[PDB]
Amino acid sequence: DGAPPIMGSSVYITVELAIAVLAILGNVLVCWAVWLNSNLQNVTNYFVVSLAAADIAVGVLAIPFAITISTGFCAACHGCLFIACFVLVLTQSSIFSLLAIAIDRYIAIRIPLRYNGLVTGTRAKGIIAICWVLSFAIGLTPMLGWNNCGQPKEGKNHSQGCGEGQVACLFEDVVPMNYMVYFNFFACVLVPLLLMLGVYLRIFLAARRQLADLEDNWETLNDNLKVIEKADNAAQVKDALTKMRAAALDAQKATPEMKDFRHGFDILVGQIDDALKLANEGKVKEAQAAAEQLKTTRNAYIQKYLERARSTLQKEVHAAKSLAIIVGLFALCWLPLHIINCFTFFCPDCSHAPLWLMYLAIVLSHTNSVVNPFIYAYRIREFRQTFRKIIRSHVL
Ligand SMILES: CC(C)CCC[C@@H](C)[C@H]1CC[C@H]2[C@@H]3CC=C4C[C@@H](O)CC[C@]4(C)[C@H]3CC[C@]12C
Ligand SMILES: CC(C)CCC[C@@H](C)[C@H]1CC[C@H]2[C@@H]3CC=C4C[C@@H](O)CC[C@]4(C)[C@H]3CC[C@]12C
Ligand SMILES: CC(C)CCC[C@@H](C)[C@H]1CC[C@H]2[C@@H]3CC=C4C[C@@H](O)CC[C@]4(C)[C@H]3CC[C@]12C
Ligand SMILES: Nc1nc(NCCc2ccc(O)cc2)nc2nc(-c3ccco3)nn12
Ligand SMILES: CCCCCCCC/C=C\CCCCCCCC(=O)O
Ligand code: NA
């Protein structure tokens, strides 16, 4: 007996088709937005588009392939392998795009002055092409001979009535589990995810250190102003002005609109030097007087540039957190399937995960191709505003 298999298959297929429609629709919207809006045409978003293209292909190709292979139909074994492994190409391309995005944001926060000369559109396009070629080679490695085509299941073969040279096309009968665990999971998925974690950690550490240095320079300036006003001798005034001069050169070093910026620090450093020249001549009262002028420069220029530096860094932190959420949802959607394969492979004494749980893990991995458009809409204003413009105009 047993419940007719078509009832559970009907549920699985209906859900897969629903996922495919949403993956296509949301990721077409991502691509449309980047095409339409020049504010979104930057190197970081070329990798976003390449990632969206991979998720569109999940809806158009990988999900129809997944539906097909669930039937166990008779097929030439290398045709079966291609149907079984093509999703691994798309998932490897996703990993490469995610890693490139992390490295891009790391270069941007670490050497912002060098970023635009290092990371160019033409270089990014070449990297994307190379990553797609490598993704094919990695995901289709079983077609080069690392496969179970040489050891068919003759009982399944005959019970399904397959012809000569055909196998019943079932994922775990043709794709070796040592490939899936050692090569795909450990080397190709888990190592890059761990690298991505380390890069994001370095981004947040770099932002935190720059904000700290900003605050240190600011408090150094203000405290030494208090020392000068409280002072009773030219050499103490002289000492404090020397500490202010270094903090000021550090802040200028670490902060059109850049010509106004120089003028503010020019007034500041020139005023420190005027007060120091007085100091070396022992005119401490005139030095203190001249040091009071610094307060109007601090209020008119230096505090303004401190605030803009701070807000720029907080925006980069917020943007890096958004992109890291994407990486974390990729891991949440793909790890269950990988972990099931580890049990299958490493615990021969364990009963195999039941079929309903296999298909639930497969559906979960596919739902990853729906979620990124929602993260962009909720977390990134320029995407959200462009989405709104597109829908109101071309759908309403
Ligand atoms: C532009 C896009 C849509 C092209 C899609 C190409 C797909 C549909 C083609 C390319 C290679 C094809 C496979 C190659 C060989 C076999 C083995 C045969 O025993 C069953 C069909 C099967 C499994 C084919 C299924 C269809 C297939 C996967
Ligand atoms: C990243 C997070 C969400 C991972 C979720 C953990 C999931 C994938 C884990 C938690 C408990 C695990 C199950 C617990 C025990 C068994 C019985 C064994 O005979 C087959 C594997 C199986 C069925 C495991 C499959 C994987 C499993 C379901
Ligand atoms: C960064 C983190 C998520 C790394 C992933 C942890 C994975 C590799 C760990 C978590 C739980 C682990 C499993 C827990 C228990 C068993 C049963 C044992 O008889 C064989 C090993 C096996 C099947 C382990 C394999 C490795 C395993 C799947
Ligand atoms: N183990 C596995 N199985 C399947 N499909 C087969 C599910 C199944 C498993 C056993 C069985 O008797 C009948 C069906 N797809 C699968 N996809 C993956 C995968 C993709 C990326 C990482 O793991 N693993 N994987
Ligand atoms: C701008 C993005 C362009 C993407 C280009 C992708 C082209 C890759 C196509 C073929 C790669 C060949 C890798 C070899 C895989 C094994 C071949 C096989 O056995 O079928
Ligand atoms: Na993806």
From Swiss-Prot:
Record's subcellular location: Cell membrane
Q: Which residues lie on this side of the membrane: Extracellular?
A: 5-10, 70-80, 147-176, 347-354
Glycan-carrying positions:
157
| Parts forming coiled coils | none
Q: How is it modified after translation?
A: Ubiquitinated. Deubiquitinated by USP4; leading to stabilization and expression at the cell surface.
What's the superkingdom here?
Eukaryota
Q: Which residues bind adenosine?
A: 172, 341, 365-366
Question: Transmembrane region positions?
Answer: 11-35, 46-69, 81-103, 124-146, 177-201, 323-346, 355-378
Cystine pairs: 74-162, 77-149, 80-169, 347-350
Q: What is its main location?
A: membrane
Cite the GO molecular-function annotations of the record: alpha-actinin binding; calmodulin binding; enzyme binding; G protein-coupled adenosine receptor activity; identical protein binding; lipid binding; protein-containing complex binding; type 5 metabotropic glutamate receptor binding
Q: What's the record's remark on domains? A: The cytoplasmic C-terminal domain is necessary for targeting the non-ubiquitinated form of this protein to the cell surface.
The name on file for this protein is Adenosine receptor A2a
Q: Which organism is it from?
A: Homo sapiens (Human)
Supply the gene name: ADORA2A
Q: Which residues of the full protein are shown?
A: 2 to 308 of 412
